[PDB]
Scaffold this active site. Structure first.
Site, short mmCIF file in Angstrom:
data_model
loop_
_atom_site.label_atom_id
_atom_site.label_comp_id
_atom_site.label_asym_id
_atom_site.label_seq_id
_atom_site.Cartn_x
_atom_site.Cartn_y
_atom_site.Cartn_z
N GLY A 85 0.83 -1.21 0.00
CA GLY A 85 0.00 0.00 0.00
C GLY A 85 0.86 1.25 0.00
O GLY A 85 2.09 1.17 0.05
N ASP B 176 -11.42 8.39 -5.63
CA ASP B 176 -11.25 7.04 -6.18
C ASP B 176 -12.56 6.24 -6.21
O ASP B 176 -12.67 5.16 -5.62
CB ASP B 176 -10.10 6.29 -5.49
CG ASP B 176 -9.70 5.01 -6.23
OD1 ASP B 176 -10.08 4.81 -7.42
OD2 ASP B 176 -8.97 4.20 -5.62
N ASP C 23 -11.06 2.86 0.13
CA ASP C 23 -10.18 3.93 0.58
C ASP C 23 -10.11 5.14 -0.35
O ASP C 23 -10.25 5.04 -1.58
CB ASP C 23 -8.77 3.38 0.79
CG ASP C 23 -8.69 2.45 1.98
OD1 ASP C 23 -9.28 2.75 3.03
OD2 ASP C 23 -8.00 1.41 1.86
#
Ligand SMILES: [Mg+2]
Length: 269
Positions: A20, A135, A153
């Site tokens: 990540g 996103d 996220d």
């Protein structure tokens, strides 16, 4: 008072899930007080990171912890003590795009409208606090159950050529790096296009560098075969070049709710 946080011992790391932004992500199992096994993703932050990146890592955790929305991915806990673990619920059905691809032949349009509405409700909540997501795409939506999808996220660019999702982005985002609730509306409509296309990539026939030229000419993504015409009109309004002319998410929730109820009724006859 009782211990509040998750104890580190109640989380067992099983394997690497991936890399990540802030560090490595592990797949693990969290054992709660009732003894239940909950499958989790454990995000970590490199101990060597700048204290700025460490702050931002915590900031994202804090937002996800507090959102607590049925259509936003759930945070299970935070272990602040180093090494700092952000414990997220893992969803076995996986990403929405792949779920749509494998279930195309059985999925009804009603369900595609439902997923659109669910994500729209999440976005209306974010819009109410002027929180820009960046996103909103089917690869970043998780399937909690066939009845429930959850937005993932926040877009990494808030933290802050970066492999930007050009094919999903508003012209002002592409041209001027402007990210607002209105650029989220643009992106959301691209997400709807993906959903109603069973996970097709937007502008799959173009290279990233071609995209802005096409948009400036007034060309847009075409109507997906099974897209209700009303929803395509909605998408086209979201793709107004002028951000101020796009619907707000509050308006889109009303519109999508009406379409959902209509499609449910039309379906019976
Ligand atoms: Mg106009």
């Amino acid at each position: 008072g009782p211990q509040y946080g998750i104890a580190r011992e109640d989380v067992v790391l099983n394997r690497i899930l991936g890399e990540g932004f802030f560090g490595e992500v592990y797949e693990g199992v969290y054992t709660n007080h009732k003894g239940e096994k909950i499958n989790v993703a454990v995000k970590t932050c490199k101990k060597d990171c700048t204290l700025d990146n460490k702050e931002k890592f915590m900031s994202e955790a804090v937002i996800m912890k507090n959102l607590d929305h049925p259509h936003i991915v759930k945070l299970i806990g935070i272990i602040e003590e180093e090494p700092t673990w952000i414990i997220m619920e893992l969803y076995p059905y996986g990403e929405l795009g792949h779920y749509l691809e494998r279930n195309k032949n059985s999925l009804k349009v009603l369900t595609l409208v439902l997923y659109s509405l669910q994500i729209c409700k999440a976005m209306a909540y974010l819009e109410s606090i002027n929180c820009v997501h960046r996103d909103i795409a089917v690869r970043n939506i998780l399937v909690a159950s066939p009845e429930c999808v959850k937005l993932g996220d926040f877009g990494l660019s808030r933290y802050i050529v970066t492999r930007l999702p050009i094919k999903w982005m508003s012209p002002e985002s592409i041209n001027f790096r402007r990210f607002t609730t209105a650029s989220d509306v643009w992106m959301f409509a691209v997400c709807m296009w993906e959903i109603l296309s069973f996970g097709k990539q937007p502008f799959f026939w173009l290279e990233n560098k071609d995209v802005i030229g096409v948009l400036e000419k007034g060309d847009r993504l075409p109507k997906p075969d099974l897209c209700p015409p009303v929803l395509y009109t909605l998408m086209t309004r979201c793709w107004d070049y002028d951000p101020s002319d796009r619907p707000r998410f509050t308006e889109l929730v009303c519109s999508l709710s009406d379409v959902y109820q209509m499609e449910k009724d039309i379906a019976m006859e």
